[PDB]
């Protein structure tokens, strides 16, 4: 019955595609994490310019709201999607709820790392909500990975 | 139709289109960093003005650029021509930024040097023309990667 299944594979991939776009947006916050207190050098490495991180986290925030806006535009995965959409709302929330240390002239490095740097030894100002958001997008990626693998398996199962 | 062999055309096409959508999302994230140029996080959630402190924001954009290049390096018959065209575009984006360190790599990178690097509609290039071009290669690599997947699905007839 290749008629039905043709659609089913498109639909499932469409979701997996949408999910990876959000998993990649989030990974860009991990690259932003490598940029706290850094400028560009001629050789292409990163050199230190300490404790000016206001617009770095501003863009980190900007991305974290794109993530929510992307999740919203998403069968069967309702629970794992809404659980992820709630996670990204509490990442934006915790960032915006910390302006007094993330929203000033000369945002320091220390409180910058506390917001977008995973495994930061000192999670206080948003990282925990980001780590929890990374795990939440894994369970959803795997769910939509398996969801599409199931529609391909329908091809061959007698 | 060779039903087991038609899959693993779909699977492999899927995998590439995924990894291709990955680098688009990283591209699209740079546009989010272009909205942050000379901005700060406010209480109500909006972006309030804080000009001329932009060094770290462009270092963030720069690392995304070398992740884009690395991703395209880990990436295919009809795409080998389009993969290398995209990868090459992403290295001239990473090279126009470092070649401009004195403007984009100093304490107090001004709002207007940043809008010539990652902002697409500026009046241009510190990096933007290589960005707009990189975004061009990817959009045609994605078209190719999409057509590869549609051709595999099509083989089921």
């Amino acid at each position, epitope marked *: 019955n290749l008629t*039905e299944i*043709s*659609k089913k594979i498109t639909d499932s991939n469409a979701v997996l595609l949408a999910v990876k776009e959000v998993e990649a947006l989030l990974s860009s916050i991990d690259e932003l994490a490598k940029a706290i207190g850094k400028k560009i050098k001629n050789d292409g490495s990163l050199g230190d310019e300490a404790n000016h991180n206001e617009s770095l986290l501003a863009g980190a925030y900007t991305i974290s709201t794109l993530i929510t806006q992307k999740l919203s535009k998403l069968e069967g995965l309702k629970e794992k999607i809404a659980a992820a959409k709630k996670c990204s709302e509490e990442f934006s929330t915790k960032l915006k709820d910390n302006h007094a240390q993330l929203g000033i002239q000369g945002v320091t490095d220390e409180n910058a790392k506390k917001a977008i740097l995973k495994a930061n030894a000192a999670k206080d100002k948003g990282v925990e909500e980001l780590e929890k958001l990374s795990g939440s997008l894994e369970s959803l990626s795997k769910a939509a990975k398996e969801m599409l693998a199931n529609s391909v398996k329908e091809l061959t199962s007698p | 139709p060779n039903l087991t062999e038609i899959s693993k055309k779909i699977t492999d096409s899927n995998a590439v289109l995924l990894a291709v959508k990955e680098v688009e999302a990283l591209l699209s994230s740079i546009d989010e960093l272009a909205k942050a140029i000379g901005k700060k996080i406010k209480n109500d959630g909006s972006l309030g003005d804080e000009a001329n402190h932009n060094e770290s924001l462009l270092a963030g954009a720069y690392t995304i650029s070398t992740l884009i290049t690395q991703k395209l390096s880990k990436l295919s018959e009809g795409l080998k021509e389009k993969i290398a065209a995209a990868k090459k575009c992403s290295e001239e984006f990473s090279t126009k930024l470092k070649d401009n360190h004195a403007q984009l790599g100093i304490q107090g990178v001004t709002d207007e040097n940043a809008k010539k690097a990652i902002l697409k509609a500026n009046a241009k290039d510190k990096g933007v023309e290589e960005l707009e071009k990189l975004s061009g290669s990817l959009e045609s690599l994605s078209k190719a990667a999409k*057509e590869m997947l*549609a*051709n595999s*699905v099509k083989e089921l*007839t």
Partner: antibody
Amino acid sequence: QVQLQESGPGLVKPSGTLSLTCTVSGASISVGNWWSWVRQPPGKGLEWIGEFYHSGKTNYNPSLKSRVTISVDKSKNQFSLKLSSVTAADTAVYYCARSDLLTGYFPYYFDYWGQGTLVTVSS
Amino acid sequence: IQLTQSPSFLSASVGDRVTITCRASQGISSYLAWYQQKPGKAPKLLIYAASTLQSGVPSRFSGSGSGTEFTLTISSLQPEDFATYYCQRLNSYPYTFGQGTKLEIKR
């Protein structure tokens, strides 16, 4: 802008070979898309002849397979239609056409057409 | 495999609502397209995926369908819609066209 132009003789004698060429501007047939021929006898409806992809894959209408061939000039950005052993039933307006995924992922839909050329079969 | 368009001909005044049906002999999912054709011109794609407008085709057109029954509707007919209309099945080749429907403007 994507444009398609059909060229070829408008008159063929029975049992002879029909030839037509489609000149594509605004789009490279080597880069992507499915390219196709479609036919419409005057007064009747539309019938799809065949299609090719730059990968080399080619599909033909079963009702015409024995006598249809489609060739591609990657260097001229053109493709051709060859129809052997034509009778008066093959008299039609002939169109070349492009297929695009459009806003989706599958299948391809016909979004660009040429102006069409009338080919009549008579003696 | 087989595609039947319900009305072969239809007279309708300007303003009227039109309904045109297409019937597939097997499931073709949502893989269907609608075209308008004015005399001496190439088919113009109005609707694809059986409910999606092409960019620029007016709101007055709309299509709905899945699983062998498809319908194209024109609300508030205009003079600019005297045309034959064709569905098209695009799930497999050949991409069978509907037999057509001429849209006369009645008197």
